[PDB]
Design a protein around this ligand. Structure first.
Ligand SMILES: CO[C@H]1/C=C/O[C@@]2(C)Oc3c(C)c(O)c4c(O)c(c(/C=N/N5CCN(C)CC5)c(O)c4c3C2=O)NC(=O)/C(C)=C\C=C\[C@H](C)[C@H](O)[C@@H](C)[C@@H](O)[C@@H](C)[C@H](OC(C)=O)[C@@H]1C
Lengths: 105, 95, 249, 225, 1114, 31, 158
């Protein structure tokens, strides 16, 4: 996985230095290496919903679209992360509220 | 192009909030005595632009800030008593 | 534990998950029996401490190691309660800060130490009594409420006692409730009791902090509302020579 | 349609650099006017600049004349920064003679004091020579249109003379912007501010007035045969 | 426009009827049309048979039995619309026929008895409950059986869970404690297990036989020789411990319950209770946990072999293993029918209690049926459910897809099955096993994420309520025509092949075959295989399945797009998308939002309000078209005709379109030409730029209807009256109200304008003398009546579409006590786009309109056409919604090639195919150019040159071929309308489907300065002339504190809320032009002091030097 | 954050709480 | 909505909403500036269904002049969830926010709304300009680093 990435970014640098995706992600515009390499390279190894790592990697890359199973195995992780946000968000500013109380004076 | 020379203003005071407290009280006295209070009057007075043009800038706060950076004004922590600073203010056309 | 649970765990200042063992005294190391039950000894001539470890214990000291009092022995979290009473309040302070920033740092945030420093200062704000001066010897009192009753009952009106105290590790929320201010103590769940206890005793507020003042809708004691600034008056030049013409009549 | 015909202010410097504001304007005509003008401004305002230089003793675009501290390029570039205007109104081209003495600083005014030609910016650094200073010059000045560089024309006069970049366009910079002014209930009417930058020769108001005349002149051609 | 299909894999079976869960359940719980002899348990029949042989106090001794015989559902008193109009539950009278028996024998078979009213379903899938449509959403909970699980409170231990069908028995837990003791838990009471065993004749020896072996665990079962003695004496001490107060030997009374008889514990009749425990426990079982009445003793059935299995699991046999409380082999669905029948069961068990009390009272020879039956229990219990249970939703009506979605909704929360919104994490996670049963996308974002979910497309709920998926069977090599819907349980046994797998005719095509088995992906021999997937669709929900290039969409953005579509407001010029997944025909059709022919015939009457059709014989039907109605959500759903007066009909082809329907193809928004580039910060962050040309074309414009209501009551001071003679009012005011006090049809109604006039009495004192002398002398005589009308809320309004009136006593109309007459006025609006509307595509690209640009600006193609939306690219690679790009390219082809497409999920368009279409499309777009006598103008070149330097174009090739390449690549040379020049570097341009969403700036946004403050709280709320104030929350307070904002904060707490004195001083001051107030003492301080005093507690103020100061003096 | 010394009056206690607490928005809850 | 044409120190503000927001303010202004004799007759001549005179919008602007509004969005997570702006009369029904200010506010133009408050005392007004003005608050109070800094799209160009 690491070599596809570090050589998707080799390509862009050496020919296509002004590629949108590249230029954006090299400046501070948007994007980042893991994102890019999910678009152009390979999405890589996937974790099951129980910690274990699926020993068949998502070989595909959005551009060349991933597939049913490739899609499904790489969905468990999407949720035990999208819940992470929603469980952090729902607690309004619980920590800031604790903090404001000890300190305000 | 934010506020009329705002960095030069902070420099006058010991604490940020002083500038805030003064700019208030000066606008406060400025407001009451229909602008007949000015220390900058002549052609320094702040102005607007319209469908006509060049009419006095209504914002008292603005005035205090320009008035303050001519040095002319004097602010203090405790010199001059309030109970006698209120009455003596009615000297050249009051409220 | 890591992430946001850990940040709470520190502020709330609780016996953490994975209570990594710390040597009570300094001496030498003597790990023994890796099979039945596993235990690390700390020993010098004189003292000899025996710490029994879960086995699953990820200790990282090899045998015959030299060691320092209060230094971790088993890896994982330090119970900042065990630390306080075994290395100091100052020493505890520097641990907490260093450890919270650790999370924020490793996730990716940058924010000043002096921020966390301020809160940790409050987590220590309190002290318990040993041998009192004009109260009962069990009370939990604010550190600089019993500072005027320490090196002032010795600076002028000397006598009785300077009052002996011990530091206490209040956990942020618990350091919240125990405030001099009935006004703010009220907002909290049990309001009767505050108002009960407080009324029985003369209890004046003083309205030191913010919450208090807001409760009564008074003008916040900070910024434009800080005594240090709020009293500033402003006068004009022509107006100032209307005081030279009127203060000697 | 409603409303009224607009106001044209022009806060001016006095030679180079002019500001111009055609204020209240229908939603769009800020660009509908400012853009075509900008174009013409930097592109058709007839002017006059250096075109070919011969200097005695050795040629080429890259060299070093002994006794002269600068090098052929810094001379050639300095040259380009020289402004000059033509009095005799049917003049097509001229040549300029420069006689350079001993240890001295050579200004643009140390040129030949020939009339039919007033040197607009005579306090220019041109070049500096040390002791035993020999520099002879013959530079062609020419009437042209836009920016026509040395690569295209290839101005011959001698065989040791090197052609220069021709910046005949008294405007050297043009920039405009179109914000939007309130007008009663309407908050979104266009306000066009043109900003011109010229040399000595032609004033900005002149530039603009020329430019407006040009596009006005071209729109005419659109008339049924 | 013509249609181009894509991708291989043909579907062996069409999709199930979709509204199945809903419709087909109730039906079979309701057994409405089946001879009352055949009707066979579960549903209404069950609940009946469950309770009915109702013996009297002292069974079969004092006479009186009463038993069930059969039930009849009636004919509904009112029409389906009549009910909605007059706020009624669309119901039917359920009478039950029962016979009462004596000790001396009576055959009193009372001619039916009213048992209460029963609500019933639409054809649609939904209910009507007091007007208003409703959805009974189907819930999931743990399936009845025996389970185990590890002790989370006790590390390295195991509890033992016994679960019966819900509201039919309690939770029983065995749990060996860290103290030897074993303890049975139940009814939230915990007692030593032995007791219950002692009752089942288990001696202290037979325990050492069946339950020693594994460990010395029996140690804590045995040291209680305290009670291992007498069965009857055990029964008592248990009775004592469980439900206390009354300790004699008739414990058999209670103990019979959680033992024999379908009283409580019927974990199963022939269902899982046994099956499960016969497969997960120790084989061999009947019906209830322990069989009681055998010959007086209590015989064991489940309890021991559980206690056994638990014990053989703390050391235990290999193969003895903990249970997956998450596996969909232990998660069942409770369908409507099941929940209604469960509530129907509550009714009876209440009527029975009532009947039991009355038989005893009355004389046993007078009592008949009808004379014993309550008819209020059932009526109430069924009423309570449909109206008040959390599982009874309103109805997502925004568009026809929404409603559909709402039916196949699966919840985890609610009643009985009770997951609080403050629980679960793995209960949220997508389980391997959701594959094909529940969508792994299409969940809600925050807070509910994981607990609310949608049904997978081809999936279906089975007899006992587990979801089943279809899998094709493979006879080693061949791929059969036989499909099998199987359990998530009956699935972990086979080597299932993906549908991706190729097939030469009807057999496998490669030696390395992709497949899952027991979940994890495995590559397998063409022989190894045991089943196949029917279609990739199988895996996802409907809305998911609506996403063209799902392949190349990152899962996370795909969920947003999977939603939002729900939020799509139906448009005037609805239009199905230029690129589809096929599914759009059927979603419209199954929603029944659209009309369709009945039996191939001929059309005869075709106008705005009717389609009538001469069928093949069959008589003649006229079908009325619902026209400009109003959704539950204000959506405005209406039908449009799509057939010609006189033509042969398609056995059932579209007769008339729905609301989001264009020619029977789901049309949730519009397709439009888009540029993918930044503008001038106008598409910054997520904002969108609109070509006003859209508005001109009445494109994104939608109709919305609001509804207003006003009542009339009597009170101590008189009746409120819906008059038209409102006092103190111009004729200008009343200009529009009929002789009644109700607005006319088709009035333009502005904010403030009178909608319904009405007059309360109100007796605010009695007019003082002197001021009657003048009132008489000058004429204008005193009045007994107040204005209190309706009037249009600030900002609302539009054109008055419909009025409606229900007065007291009207035919079937009952309205709440002390109220007579209700008026409803409907107002309609036509909307159009606006700066602040939300637009989104199916790939999850949301964003708000920030700028409508006049046509002069806007990037335009050389031929002259400008684009319609400018979508910023920076919002692409961060999210990985790459499909949205793919979809635009084809849309460029489609634009010129003039066609529509069908690229289904994980089986649609492939790049080369799109590129070929593009190549084909360019020869036309430039075919035109060169045919109309043109080509490659100086601008295009300027670009092309620098374009090859970028590295997108082939150096060496001619400007023409250079253009083709660049085009084909989905890009093209674009011109800035503002300045005739181009943007250097080509821009990707095409047609894109986008929807306008639920939320509009129109419905958001208010401004308040001063207005109605409340007479309760004394802060601003209520808005009788203008809207109401924004709230300043605790977090905003901290911020003001964090600033130095002393006063700005103080202001927000005094002169801007309840501080009447200074609140008013403020207003007065500004009116005058004085520098606002300086509120010396804040009211809220004075109010504090006092509320305290009224409790005693001195509370006294002190200044600096420390002498009482005083804050009052008023 | 005027990159100066502090002015007396800054209610830092609260600036501390926010400062520490806002990035807790991006702090993982999964432990 | 995004407001790219405005200076760092400026604001969105739908004229209709700015009109209601400052209404009392505009009432006396309508007295002082001639036209409308009674303060009550003024309220009449704005209320009267709709259709406001050119001469009034002309005035609204003369009231607004130099005053600021507090904008405020969402979970107010630090002081910076409240900033101060000189309001600019605008076409339509959306407050338009400067693209730089988004950083702090953590607003996104995908549906977010903001709320707006008008301070009244010259104090409050001073207080707002001097201490909370968006353009006076350039660096983060957490870590002296720039909070109002070039971003996403501004960086692209550069
Ligand atoms: C008694 O019904 C209530 C139950 C409360 O009790 C309680 C504890 O049990 C609930 C159950 C059992 C749900 O299944 C549910 C739900 O599926 C849902 C939301 C919350 N949804 N929103 C998410 C974002 N948003 C901006 C607004 C709403 C819920 O809160 C609940 C919910 C509860 O809270 N929704 C979703 O996630 C999805 C996928 C779609 C929603 C679509 C529309 C909007 C709704 O279906 C409309 C038509 C109404 O049906 C609801 C409004 C009901 O309100 C009533 C009385 O009509 C409500 C469910």
């Amino acid at each position: 996985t690491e070599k596809v990435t570090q050589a998707v970014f080799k390509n862009f640098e050496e020919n296509y230095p002004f590629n949108p995706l590249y230029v954006m992600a090299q400046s501070g515009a948007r994007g980042n290496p893991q994102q890019i390499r999910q678009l152009c390279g390979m999405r890589g190894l996937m974790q099951k919903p129980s910690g274990e790592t699926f020993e068949v990697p998502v070989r595909s890359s959005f551009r060349e679209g991933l597939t049913v199973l490739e899609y499904f195995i790489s969905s468990h992780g999407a949720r035990k992360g999208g819940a992470d946000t929603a469980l952090r968000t729902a607690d309004s500013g619980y920590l800031t509220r604790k903090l404001v109380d000890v300190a305000h004076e | 192009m934010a506020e009329p020379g705002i960095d030069k203003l902070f420099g006058m005071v010991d604490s940020k909030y002083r500038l805030t407290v003064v700019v208030a009280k000066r606008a406060q006295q400025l407001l009451r005595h229909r602008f007949k209070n000015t220390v900058l009057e002549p052609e320094e007075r702040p102005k607007m632009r319209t469908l006509e043009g060049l009419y006095d800038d209504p914002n008292a706060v603005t005035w205090a800030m320009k008035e303050l950076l001519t040095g002319r004004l004097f602010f203090g922590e405790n010199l001059v008593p309030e109970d006698r600073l209120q009455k003596e203010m009615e000297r050249l056309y009051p409220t | 534990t890591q992430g946001l649970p850990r940040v709470i765990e520190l502020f709330e200042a609780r016996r953490p998950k994975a209570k990594a063992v710390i040597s009570e005294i300094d001496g030498v190391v003597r790990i023994e029996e890796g099979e039945d039950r596993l235990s690390v000894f700390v020993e010098s001539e004189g003292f000899s401490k025996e710490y029994k470890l879960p086995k699953d214990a990820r200790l990282l000291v090899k045998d015959g190691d030299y060691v320092e009092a209060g230094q971790p022995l088993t890896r994982g979290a330090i119970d900042p309660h065990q630390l306080l009473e075994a290395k100091g309040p100052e020493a505890v302070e520097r641990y907490l800060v260093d450890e919270i920033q650790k999370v924020y740092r490793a996730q990716g945030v940058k924010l000043h130490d002096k921020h966390i420093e301020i809160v940790v200062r409050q987590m220590l704000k309190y002290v318990e009594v040993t041998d009192p001066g004009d109260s009962r010897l069990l009370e939990g009192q604010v550190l600089e409420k019993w500072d005027v009753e320490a090196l002032n009952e010795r600076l002028i009106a000397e006598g009785k006692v300077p009052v002996a105290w011990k530091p206490l590790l209040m956990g942020v929320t618990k350091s919240a409730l125990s405030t001099k201010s009935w006004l703010s103590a009220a907002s909290f769940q049990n309001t009767t009791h505050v108002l009960t206890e407080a009324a029985i005793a003369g209890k004046k507020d003083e309205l030191i902090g913010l919450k208090e003042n807001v409760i009564l809708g008074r003008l916040i004691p900070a910024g434009t509302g800080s005594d240090f600034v709020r009293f500033t008056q402003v006068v004009d030049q022509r107006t100032l020579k209307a005081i030279e013409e009127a203060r000697k009549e | 349609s409603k409303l009224k015909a607009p106001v044209f202010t022009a806060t001016t410097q006095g030679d180079h650099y002019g500001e111009f504001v055609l204020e209240p304007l229908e939603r769009g005509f800020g660009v509908t006017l400012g853009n075509p003008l900008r174009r013409i401004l930097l592109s058709s305002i007839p002017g006059t600049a250096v075109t070919s230089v011969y200097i005695e003793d050795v040629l080429h675009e890259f060299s070093t004349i002994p006794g002269v501290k600068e090098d052929v390029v810094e001379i050639i570039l300095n040259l380009k920064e020289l402004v000059v205007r033509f009095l005799d109104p049917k003049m097509a081209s001229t040549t300029l003679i420069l006689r350079a003495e001993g240890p001295k600083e050579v200004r643009a005014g140390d040129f030949t004091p020939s009339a039919d030609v007033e040197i607009m910016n005579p306090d220019l650094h041109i070049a500096t020579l040390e002791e035993g200073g020999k520099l002879y010059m013959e530079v062609r000045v020419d009437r042209g249109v836009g920016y026509v560089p040395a690569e295209r024309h290839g101005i011959k006069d001698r065989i040791n003379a090197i052609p220069v970049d021709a910046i005949f366009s008294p405007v050297r910079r043009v920039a405009f912007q179109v914000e939007d002014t309130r007008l009663g209930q309407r908050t979104d009417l266009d306000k066009l501010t043109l900003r011109i930058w010229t040399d000595g020769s032609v004033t900005p108001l002149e530039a603009l007035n020329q430019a407006v005349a040009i596009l006005k002149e071209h729109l005419n051609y659109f008339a049924n045969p | 426009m013509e249609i181009k299909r894509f991708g291989r894999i043909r579907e062996v079976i069409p999709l199930p009827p979709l509204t199945e869960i809903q419709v087909e359940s109730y039906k079979k719980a309701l057994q409405a049309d089946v001879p009352p002899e055949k009707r066979e348990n579960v549903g209404i029949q069950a609940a009946f048979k469950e309770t009915f042989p109702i013996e009297e106090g002292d069974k079969g001794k004092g006479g009186l039995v009463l038993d069930f015989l059969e039930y009849r559902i009636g004919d509904p008193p009112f029409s389906q619309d009549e009910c909605r109009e007059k706020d009624l539950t669309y119901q039917a009278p359920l009478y039950a026929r029962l016979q009462l028996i004596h000790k001396d024998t009576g055959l009193i078979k009372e001619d039916e008895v009213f048992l209460g009213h029963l609500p019933l379903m639409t054809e649609d899938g939904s209910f009507i409950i007091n007007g208003a449509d409703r959805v009974i959403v189907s819930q999931i909970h743990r399936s009845p059986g025996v389970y185990f699980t590890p002790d989370p409170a006790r590390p390295g231990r195991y509890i033992a869970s016994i679960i019966p069908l819900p509201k039919r028995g309690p939770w029983i837990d065995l749990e060996v404690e860290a103290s030897g003791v074993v303890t049975m838990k139940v009814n939230k009471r915990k007692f030593p297990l032995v007791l219950l065993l002692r009752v089942l004749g288990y001696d202290q020896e037979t325990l050492v036989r069946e339950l020693s072996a594994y460990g010395d665990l029996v140690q804590g079962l045995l040291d209680e020789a305290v009670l291992a003695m007498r069965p009857e004496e055990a029964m008592v001490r248990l009775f004592t411990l469980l439900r206390p107060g009354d300790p004699p030997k008739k414990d058999k009374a209670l103990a019979y319950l959680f033992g024999l008889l379908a009283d409580p514990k019927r974990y199963d009749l022939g269902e899982a209770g046994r099956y499960k425990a016969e497969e997960k426990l120790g084989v061999g079982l009947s019906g209830r946990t322990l069989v009681r009445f055998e010959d007086g003793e209590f015989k064991d059935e489940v309890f021991l072999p559980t206690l056994r299995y638990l014990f053989a699991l703390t050391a235990g046999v290999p193969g003895h293993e903990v249970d997956d409380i998450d596996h969909l082999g232990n998660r069942r669905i409770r369908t409507v029918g099941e929940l209604m029948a469960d509530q129907f069961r509550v009714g009876l068990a209440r009527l029975a209690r009532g009947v039991r009390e009355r038989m005893v009272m009355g004389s046993p020879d007078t009592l008949t049926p009808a004379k014993l039956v309550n008819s209020r229990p059932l009526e109430a219990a069924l009423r309570e459910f449909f109206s008040r249970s959390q599982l009874s939703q309103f109805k997502d009506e925004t568009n026809p897809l929404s409603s559909l979605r709402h039916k196949r909704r699966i919840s985890a929360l609610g009643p009985g099955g009770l997951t609080r919104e403050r629980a679960g994490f793995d209960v949220r996670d997508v389980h391997r096993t959701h594959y094909g049963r529940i969508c792994p996308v299409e969940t809600p974002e925050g807070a509910n994420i994981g607990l609310i979910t949608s049904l997978a497309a081809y999936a279906r709920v089975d007899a006992l309520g587990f979801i089943r998926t279809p899998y094709r069977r493979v006879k080693n090599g061949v791929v059969t025509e036989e499909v099998v819907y199987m359990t998530a349980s009956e699935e972990d046994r086979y080597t299932i092949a993906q549908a991706n797998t190729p097939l030469e005719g009807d057999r496998i095509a490669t030696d390395r075959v992709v497949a899952r088995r027991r979940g994890e992906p495995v590559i397998v021999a063409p022989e190894e295989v045991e089943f196949m997937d029917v279609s990739p669709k199988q895996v996802f929900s409907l809305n998911t399945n609506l996403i063209p290039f799902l392949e190349h969409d990152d899962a996370n953005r795909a969920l947003m797009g999977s939603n939002m579509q729900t939020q799509a407001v139906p448009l005037i010029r609805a239009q199905a998308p230029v690129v589809m997944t096929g599914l759009e025909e059927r979603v419209v059709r199954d929603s029944l939002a659209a009309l369709y022919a009945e039996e191939d015939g001929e059309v005869v009457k075709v106008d705005g309000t009717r389609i009538a059709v001469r069928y093949e014989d069959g008589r003649l039907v006229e079908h009325p078209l619902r026209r400009y109605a109003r959704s539950n959500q204000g959506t405005a759903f209406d039908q449009r005709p799509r057939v010609r007066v006189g033509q042969r009909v398609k056995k059932g082809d579209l007769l008339a379109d729905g609301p989001a329907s264009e020619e029977g193809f789901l049309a949730l928004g519009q397709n439009v030409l888009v540029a993918i580039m930044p503008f001038d910060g106008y598409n910054f962050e997520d904002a969108i730029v609109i070509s006003e040309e859209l508005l001109k074309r009445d494109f994104y414009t939608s109709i919305h209807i609001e509804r207003y209501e006003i009542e009339a009551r009597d009170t101590k001071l008189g009746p409120e009256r819906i008059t038209r003679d409102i006092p103190h009012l111009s004729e200008a005011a009343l200009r529009d109200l009929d002789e009644e006090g109700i607005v006319r049809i088709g009035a333009e109604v502005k904010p403030g304008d009178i909608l319904v006039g009405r007059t309360s009495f109100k007796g605010e004192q009695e007019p003082s003398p002197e001021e009657r002398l003048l009132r008489s002398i000058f004429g204008e005589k005193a009045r007994d009546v107040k204005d209190t009308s309706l009037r249009v809320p600030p900002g609302e309004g539009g054109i008055v579409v419909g009025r409606l009136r229900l007065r007291r006593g009207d035919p079937g109309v009952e309205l709440k006590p002390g109220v007579r007459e209700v008026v409803r006025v409907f107002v309609a609006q036509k909307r159009k786009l606006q700066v602040g509307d939300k637009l989104a595509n199916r790939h999850g690209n949301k964003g708000v309109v920030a700028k409508i640009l006049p046509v002069e600006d806007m990037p335009h193609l050389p031929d002259g056409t400008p684009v319609d939306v400018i979508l910023n690219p920076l919002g692409v690679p961060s999210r990985m919604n790459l499909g949205q790009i793919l979809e635009t390219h084809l849309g460029l082809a489609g634009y010129f090639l003039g066609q529509r497409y069908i690229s289904p999920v994980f089986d649609g368009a492939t790049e080369p195919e799109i590129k070929e279409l593009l190549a084909e499309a360019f020869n036309l777009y430039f075919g035109k150019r060169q045919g109309e006598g043109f080509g490659v103008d100086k601008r295009e070149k300027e670009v092309l040159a620098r374009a090859e330097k970028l590295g997108l174009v082939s150096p060496g090739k001619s400007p023409e071929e250079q253009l083709k390449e660049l085009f084909d690549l989905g890009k093209v040379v674009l011109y800035d309308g503002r300045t005739g020049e181009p943007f250097e570097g080509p821009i990707v341009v095409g047609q894109m489907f986008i929807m306008k969403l639920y939320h509009m700036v129109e419905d958001k946004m208010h401004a308040r300065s001063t207005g109605p403050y409340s007479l309760i709280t004394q802060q601003p709320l209520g808005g009788k002339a203008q809207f109401g104030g924004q709230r300043f929350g605790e977090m905003e307070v901290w911020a003001l504190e964090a600033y130095g904002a002393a006063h700005t904060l103080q202001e927000m707490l005094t002169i801007k809320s309840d501080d009447i004195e200074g609140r008013n001083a403020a207003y007065q001051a500004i009116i005058k032009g004085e520098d606002v107030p300086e509120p010396s003492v804040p009211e809220s301080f004075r109010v504090l002091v006092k509320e305290l005093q009224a409790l005693a507690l001195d509370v006294q103020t002190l200044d600096e030097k420390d002498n009482p100061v005083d804050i009052f003096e008023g | 954050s005027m990159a100066r010394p502090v002015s007396i009056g800054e209610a830092v206690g609260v600036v501390a709480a926010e400062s520490i607490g806002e990035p807790g928005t991006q702090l993982t809850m999964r432990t | 909505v995004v407001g790219p044409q405005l200076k760092l120190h400026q604001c969105g503000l739908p004229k209709r909403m700015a009109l209601e927001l400052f209404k009392p303010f505009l009432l006396k202004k309508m007295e002082e500036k001639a036209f409308a004799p009674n303060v009550k007759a003024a309220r009449r001549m704005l209320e009267r269904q709709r259709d406001i005179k050119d001469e009034v919008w002309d005035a609204l602007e003369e009231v607004i002049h130099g005053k600021v509004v507090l904008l405020n969005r969402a979970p107010t997570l630090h002081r910076l969830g409240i900033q101060a702006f000189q309001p600019v009369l605008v076409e339509g029904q959306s407050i338009q926010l400067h693209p730089l200010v988004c950083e702090a506010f953590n607003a996104d133009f995908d549906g977010d709304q903001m709320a707006v408050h008008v301070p009244l005392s010259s104090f409050a007004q001073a207080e707002a300009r001097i201490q909370m003005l968006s353009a006076h608050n350039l660096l983060s109070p957490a870590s002296g680093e720039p909070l109002a800094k070039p971003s996403r799209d501004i960086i692209l160009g550069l």
